[PDB]
Ligand binder design. Structure first.
Ligand code: CDL
Ligand code: PLX
Ligand code: PEE
Ligand code: 8Q1
Lengths: 98, 67, 124, 178, 88, 55, 80, 459, 128, 56
């Protein structure tokens, strides 16, 4: 029950040694002795990449057929086309159940 | 900011954290009340459920069992 | 639920099957039925690029709602009347389907009843 | 984990370990402190009820039935301290523990920084070198001819002596090495 | 940042605080070097509860083999300092 | 050691807190209708989610 | 930093459920020797705490006041 | 084609006339330049091969193999000059001569137009390999390993010779162009069955096919580092190349004679992959992963489809690079702790951080992480196998799951956990080892951007 | 008094439920002391080399050498062809091969007889 | 060209820039995490534009 006297003595000496070592792991004030703009981020990380990609897509990728395919735009009754100027007829005299 | 440990006491609190917490809880409750006042149908429905028993036999094309 | 209990626990031959329905002709009891009207043409629906499920007799109101959402884009709270009209039309379609279910149920409960009563006068 | 184990645990050790384990699991079941205090006092009373039993067969049977009770009644998800063997931070910092002998392989440019640290390290290395033969001699004289019965180590019994086999205990990396 | 650099005096203060909050041991009599058995007349079962209270205070678990030996507050303080690498 | 007065923590949590409140209404009212809504329900079937959550 | 422990003589189990535990254990012939150590969990700002529903309605009052003032303003402004 | 052969032959007198302290520099520089010259063979046609002369020709199947063969010599020289430091000058030159002769034989083997010349060179590759293994291996088992290497191969290839001179006596030629154009079906007869077996078993032993793969875990394990590098990266692919070349004469007999080999490959894939899970020797684990990978090449060649042939070519190249890198990575640790037991040195990521990154990338390519060419070849073979029979997806799927398991296990055992306390001689990585890893891994990743260069003649 | 816990292969019997730690003879205590002595001498022998300043390298562990040697090179010299060994070898090595051969041959025969009668729907099957 | 494709591609492309700087003298500085966080915030702001186009 409890430490034997030799156990306690050994623990004490080891504790003093360990505390001295941990104290020695400390650094001196000089110890790390080394040897001898407002919006710039938004142009080198956004404007420059979007310049290269837009140039790449417009003049190289779209040179080949079917490379960029877009979903056909929705057409509704009453719309006016910008290509032929055609007018879509309206939607057939609603029952007007109101 | 610098608050220190207190050892078995309630911790030190700042004014900004409390007013922010209360403000956001109040914002959530105001939003709920506003949306319920304006968009009740999203919870209580907008149309009634028709009872089939209230539909007559002529509304549905039913013969009087003799033809 | 009741309709599930009456079928799975009661007599299933007294109530319609959701898969095999309708089983009676559309003029079995009605004297004159007018064909259901559609407003939006096939080309209009196709131009609109509506979903196949979406292309239901309520399609013209959905087309109007889509056009209204696109026309007033920044104000995403302007298409309330159009959404209400489309929802009302879909509600009417749903109650029509409920009416069809009830009609089939009462036709089916009348049919077997009348045949078993014709058999009831044939005992002797 | 610092004391040498014995060939076996005595009856007193077993019942004490059972008491601590049962109290910990009871605290796991009783989340709140007042309820834990109540049932822990009841547990202590239940343990004290047979504190001075002198029939070792009866004491052993009672301890065995207590073990069977605990195993059925244990919490399947007992509370564990975060750095304990089952905890959520058990060996979390082992990836940061680097042995000190690695410092011997630093490039001289790396050692150019921290001159004081490495002078102290040279003194520590000289101390370790100078006391090794005395420690070996002490171990051989103290231990029995057959060999050492237990893993307990002796302290330094002379004046300018260090306890034998001390370097790796003393130069442990850290518990928060980085 | 994280927890402050806990020191030796803090460990001793907390150990003595917890001991003085124990009803079995009176505050005036208790001393740092007091044996829990000879000085305070405490049973083995009682000792286990002190160890558990220290675990709850400092938030770490002391192994049973290590725990039984600790019979003085100074011993507990030294054990905790050795575990947490406390050198002042 | 309880301390939550770091601006990084507060701002990071608050940004998601605002989403957790308003994102549903903002997103739901800007996406085109991609289905047919359930405009017709029994009342006990409309309120079932709230009823079971409260239970 | 540079702070010390509060006095240990202030931690009394009086008024807290630790009293109830003490009475229930006295009615059994035992005593609870660790109660005061838990006393700090019921003493200061931890003495009182909110219930579940009160926690759920943490900011209900202020939000309700803003909601009613906004409704009152817009309902009468809508009568142009 | 002599513009590659003759510079390779000049590496011998250059090595023998070099200074005692300049052999490694000269050999490395000039083998790298030979690799640079070899890169010109990748310019392949879409219709027929590059017929240099009556003797040598290059195809889209042999060009990547040639490039890998020439590229491997500088890496072998870099990997060998550390453990041969204390060696005498003449024995260092003899080791380098063995490597140069091996490269010369392989280069001529991959480009021979006639099957008998191909056979003679493909058998000549045995002598330098056996000398390397049994003279510079480290342990006493290296002798037995050599015998296993020698007699497994020859017992397979001696019938092949008898078949080949038989074929020339009936068709009149063994030229591969003539063999392909004047091809005729194989009848269904016992004589044709045994001629089919004689033309196939030699290549099956080289792959090796599960069942006759015993020589490989001995030879690769006991060999020195350059020996195991060349054994895994190039010598195993001789069987694949020869099977791909000789399959033309085999049809339509191959449809039913391939069943036992397909069953052996599709089950031994699982068997060897699972063997890797319980392997106390790290180098032995790496060796068994090779059998597991070459089972897939056997399946792809047996089912005889364009997708399978493309996949087999890609997988052969990718496996060569990855297995060579893994053997080098294990050798780095062996030269520290002098034991091949996997659990002896642990937690090395703490002590060697960048070599841990090398380990991670090698393990990732071993389990065919997309879009690496390991994955390209594996997935092409799996798709072709699915076409051959859908049930194959079960076996193929299972192999993929197991391969990832023993790869990352190999990573977790050696790099993670805590470093063993007693070992204290683990020095920082040298620039030579780091560059050796980089020169393995960078070409592998670069081949992802131009996979058609390694997809063979069926692309 | 309580539902009894029974051990299994992958969930073994705990120490506190093991009746051996509760029926102790003097011989049992002697055996435990002997075990401690064996462990202790090994620990001391390890720590003497471990703490040695002069030592540079890896401490060689004979137990690890014995384990690897037994797991690889000691197996064939200690093998005898027995009815159990022969049966297990034949089953575990041959049975899967013919099982898979039967499965694949059946599937491919079905597929080929379907192709022959022109009922598979191989449309859009350009790549194989 | 309409900006939809360019913006959608640039959103993903700019996320890779701090990876190309993983061998630069920002990765050994204590300002690297803030640099990564700022890049992700800018990417989010850029991705908000194609979402507006789709909602329109
Ligand atoms: C999508 C990414 C975009 C990339 C932009 C361009 C980047 C080009 C890099 C090319 C690769 C470099 C070669 C690898 C060796 C690195 C040498 C080294 O030691 O550096 C130390 C150097 C210095 O660090 P240190 O502090 O000294 O390190 C100390 C320790 O070593 C501690 O070191 P550590 O812990 O930092 O470890 C190094 C680090 C990084 O180290 C590596 O892992 C390098 C190898 C990556 C895995 C490759 C093997 C797996 C099979 C797939 C192969 C794909 C190849 C693609 C083509 C490559 C062509 C070269 O580890 C990791 O980050 C995890 C790696 C696992 C990656 C998981 C994702 C795999 C799929 C990714 C998508 C691939 C296709 C993209 C296109 C898809 C469609 C758009 O660290 C660096 O500079 C960063 C390393 C580069 C990381 C790139 C990770 C992504 C690579 C994607 C493939 C290339 C794509 C390029 C085209 C655009 C896409
Ligand atoms: C461990 C790794 C080893 C390498 C594995 C190599 C595998 C080699 C297997 C060869 C594949 C097939 C060989 C011959 C084809 C059919 C063989 C026989 O089983 O089928 C029947 C053959 O009929 C009889 O069964 C004769 C064969 C019986 C005698 C041979 C003994 C085979 C037992 C297995 C020995 C183990 C092989 C490996 C040895 C080490 C077919 O019926 P039948 O219509 O009549 O004959 C048609 C063939 N014709 C057209 C040529 C006439
Ligand atoms: C590492 C182990 C690898 C083992 C490889 C060994 C198997 C090789 C396959 C058999 C080799 C001999 C084949 C002979 C070469 C074929 C040439 C040929 O076509 O000749 C045949 C003749 O074929 C034979 O005679 C071969 C019979 C076998 C003779 C030697 C027996 C070897 C053992 C046979 C079974 C083993 C093969 C499979 C074992 C796989 C490996 C375990 C017909 O010619 P003709 O006589 O002119 O007929 C037409 C006009 N009458
Ligand atoms: C959730 C928890 C699950 C429930 C767990 C069930 C456990 C069983 C409950 C009742 C406990 C028992 O039976 S009690 C075990 C039965 N046998 C004895 O008690 C023998 C006599 N003991 C002594 O003499 C020692 O001195 C000692 C008493 C250890 C003090 O020692 P110290 O004073 O010198 O430290």
């Amino acid at each position: 029950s409890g430490y034997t006297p030799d156990e306690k003595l050994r623990l004490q000496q080891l504790r003093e040694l360990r505390r001295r070592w941990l104290k020695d792991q400390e650094l001196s004030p000089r110890e790390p002795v080394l040897p001898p703009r407002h919006s710039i981020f938004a142009v080198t990380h956004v404007l420059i990449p979007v310049w290269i990609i837009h140039y790449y897509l417009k003049y190289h990728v779209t040179a080949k057929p079917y490379t960029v395919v877009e979903r056909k735009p929705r057409i509704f009754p009453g719309d006016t086309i910008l290509e032929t100027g055609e007018v879509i007829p309206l939607m057939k005299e609603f029952p007007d159940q109101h | 900011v610098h608050i220190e440990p207190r050892y078995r006491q309630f911790p030190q609190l700042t004014r900004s954290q409390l007013i922010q917490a209360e403000f956001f809880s109040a914002t959530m409750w105001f939003w709920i009340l506003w949306r319920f006042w304006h968009d009740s149908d999203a919870v209580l429905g907008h149309f009634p459920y028709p009872d089939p028993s209230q539909w007559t036999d002529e509304e549905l094309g039913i013969l009087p069992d003799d033809e | 639920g009741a309709h599930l209990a009456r079928r799975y626990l009661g007599d299933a031959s007294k109530e319609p099957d959701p898969l095999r329905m309708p089983t009676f002709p559309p003029d079995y009891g009605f004297p004159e039925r007018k064909e259901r009207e559609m407003v939006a043409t096939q080309q209009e629906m196709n131009d609109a690029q509506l979903m196949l499920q979406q292309r239901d007799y309520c399609a013209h109101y959905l087309i109007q709602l889509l056009k209204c959402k696109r026309d007033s884009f920044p104000n995403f709270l302007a298409c309330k009347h159009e959404q209400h009209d489309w929802d009302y039309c879909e509600h009417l379609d749903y109650v029509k389907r409920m009416k069809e279910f009830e009609r089939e149920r009462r036709l089916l409960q009348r049919k077997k009843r009348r045949e078993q009563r014709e058999a009831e006068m044939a005992r002797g | 984990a610092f004391s040498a184990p014995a060939a076996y645990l005595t009856h007193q050790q077993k019942v004490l370990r059972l008491y601590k384990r049962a109290l910990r699991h009871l605290e796991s079941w009783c989340v709140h402190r007042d309820k834990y205090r109540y049932f822990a006092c009841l547990m202590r009373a239940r343990f004290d009820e047979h504190k001075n039993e002198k029939d070792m067969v009866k004491a052993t049977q009672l301890l065995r039935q207590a073990e069977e009770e605990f195993w059925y009644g244990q919490h399947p998800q007992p509370y564990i301290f975060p750095e304990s063997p089952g905890g959520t931070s058990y060996e979390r910092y082992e990836c940061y523990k680097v042995p000190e002998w690695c410092l011997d392989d630093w490039h001289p440019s790396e050692k150019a920084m921290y001159p004081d640290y490495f002078a102290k390290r040279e003194q520590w290395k000289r101390l370790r070198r100078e006391s090794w033969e005395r420690e070996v001699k002490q171990l051989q004289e103290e231990t029995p001819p057959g060999g050492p019965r237990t893993e307990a180590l002796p302290p330094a019994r002379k004046e300018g002596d260090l306890p034998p086999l001390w370097w790796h205990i003393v130069t442990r990396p850290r518990e928060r090495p980085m | 940042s994280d927890a402050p650099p806990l020191t030796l005096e803090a460990i001793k203060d907390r150990v003595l605080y917890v001991l003085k909050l124990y009803d079995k041991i009176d505050p005036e009599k208790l001393s740092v070097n007091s044996h829990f058995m000879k000085d305070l007349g405490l049973d083995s079962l009682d000792q286990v509860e002190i160890i558990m209270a220290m675990e709850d205070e400092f938030g770490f678990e002391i192994p049973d083999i290590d725990a039984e030996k600790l019979m003085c507050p100074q011993e507990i303080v030294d054990y905790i300092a050795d575990k947490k690498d406390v050198y002042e | 050691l309880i301390n939550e007065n770091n601006p990084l923590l507060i701002n990071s949590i608050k940004r998601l807190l605002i989403g957790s409140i308003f994102a549903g209404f903002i997103i739901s009212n800007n996406i085109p209708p991609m289905t047919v809504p359930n405009t017709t329900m029994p009342l006990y079937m409309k309120m079932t989610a709230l009823i079971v959550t409260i239970m | 930093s540079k702070m010390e422990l509060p006095d240990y003589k202030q931690w009394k189990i009086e008024g807290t459920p630790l009293e109830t535990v003490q009475e229930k254990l006295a009615a059994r012939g035992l005593r609870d020797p660790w109660g005061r150590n838990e006393a700090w969990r019921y003493s200061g700002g931890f003495a009182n705490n909110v219930s579940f529903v009160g926690a759920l309605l943490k900011g209900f009052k202020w939000g309700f006041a803003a909601f009613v003032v906004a409704v009152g303003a817009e309902y009468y402004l809508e009568s142009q | 084609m002599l513009k590659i052969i003759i510079p390779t032959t000049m590496l011998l007198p250059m090595t023998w006339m070099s200074k005692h302290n300049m052999i490694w520099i000269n050999a490395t520089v000039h083998s790298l330049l030979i690799s640079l010259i070899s890169l010109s063979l990748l310019n392949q046609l879409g219709e027929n091969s590059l017929n240099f002369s009556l003797t040598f020709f290059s195809d889209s199947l042999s060009a990547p193999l040639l490039v890998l063969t020439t590229w491997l010599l500088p890496l072998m020289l870099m990997a060998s000059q550390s453990h041969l430091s204390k060696e005498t000058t003449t024995r260092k030159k003899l080791y380098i001569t063995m490597l140069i002769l091996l490269q010369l034989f392989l280069i001529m083997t991959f480009t021979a137009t006639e099957l008998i010349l191909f056979y003679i060179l493909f058998e000549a590759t045995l002598v330098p390999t056996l000398i390397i293994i049994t003279r510079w291996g480290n342990q006493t088992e290296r002798l037995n390993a050599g015998l296993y290497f020698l007699f497994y191969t020859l017992a397979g290839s001696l019938p092949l010779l008898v078949a080949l001179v038989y074929i020339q006596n009936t068709t009149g030629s063994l030229n591969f162009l003539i063999i392909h154009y004047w091809s005729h079906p194989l009848s269904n007869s016992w004589s044709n069955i045994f001629m089919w077996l004689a033309c196939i078993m030699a290549f099956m032993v080289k792959m090796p096919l599960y069942g006759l793969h015993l020589w490989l875990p001995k030879a690769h394990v006991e060999a020195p580092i350059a020996g195991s590098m060349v054994l895994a990266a190039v010598l195993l692919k001789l069987g694949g190349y020869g099977m791909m070349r000789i399959t033309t004469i085999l049809n339509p007999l191959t449809n039913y004679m391939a069943y036992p080999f397909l069953m052996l490959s599709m089950w031994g894939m699982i068997m060897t992959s699972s063997i890797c899970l319980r392997q106390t020797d790290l180098k032995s684990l790496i060796a068994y992963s090779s059998v597991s990978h070459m089972a897939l090449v056997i399946v792809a060649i047996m089912i005889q489809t364009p997708w399978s042939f493309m996949g087999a070519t890609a997988l052969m190249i990718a496996h060569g690079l990855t297995s060579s890198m893994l053997f080098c990575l294990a050798n780095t640790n062996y030269e520290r702790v002098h034991s091949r037991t996997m659990i002896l040195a642990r937690g090395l990521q703490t002590l060697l951080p960048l070599m841990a990154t090398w380990w991670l990338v090698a393990s990732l390519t071993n389990l065919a992480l997309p879009p690496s060419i390991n994955l390209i070849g594996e997935l092409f073979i799996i798709t072709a196998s699915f076409s051959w029979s859908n049930i194959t997806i079960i076996l193929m799927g299972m192999n993929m799951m197991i391969t990832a398991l023993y790869s990352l296990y190999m990573l977790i055992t050696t790099q993670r956990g805590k470093y063993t306390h007693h070992i204290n001689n683990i020095k920082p990585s040298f620039t030579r080892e780091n560059a050796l890893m980089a020169l393995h891994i960078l070409p592998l990743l670069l081949l992802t951007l131009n996979p058609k260069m390694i997809l063979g003649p069926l692309y | 008094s309580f539902p009894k816990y029974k051990p299994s292969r992958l969930a073994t019997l705990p120490a506190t439920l093991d009746p051996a730690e509760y029926d102790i003879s003097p011989e049992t205590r002697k055996a435990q002391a002997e075990r401690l002595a064996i462990r202790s001498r090994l620990k001391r022998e390890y720590l003497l080399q471990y703490n040695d300043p002069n030592r540079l390298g890896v401490i060689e562990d004979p137990a690890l050498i014995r384990w690897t040697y037994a797991r690889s090179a000691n197996i064939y010299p200690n093998f005898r062809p027995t009815p159990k060994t022969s049966l297990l070898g034949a089953l575990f090595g041959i049975g899967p091969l013919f099982f898979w051969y039967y499965v694949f041959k059946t599937d491919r025969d079905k597929k080929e007889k379907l192709i022959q009668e022109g009922k598979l729907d191989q449309t859009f099957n350009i790549s194989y | 060209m309409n900006p939809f494709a360019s913006l959608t591609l640039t959103t993903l492309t700019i996320l890779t820039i701090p990876i190309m700087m993983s061998n630069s003298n920002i990765y050994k500085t204590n300002l690297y995490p803030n640099y990564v966080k700022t890049t992700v915030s800018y990417a989010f702001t850029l991705s908000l534009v194609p979402l507006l186009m789709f909602m329109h």
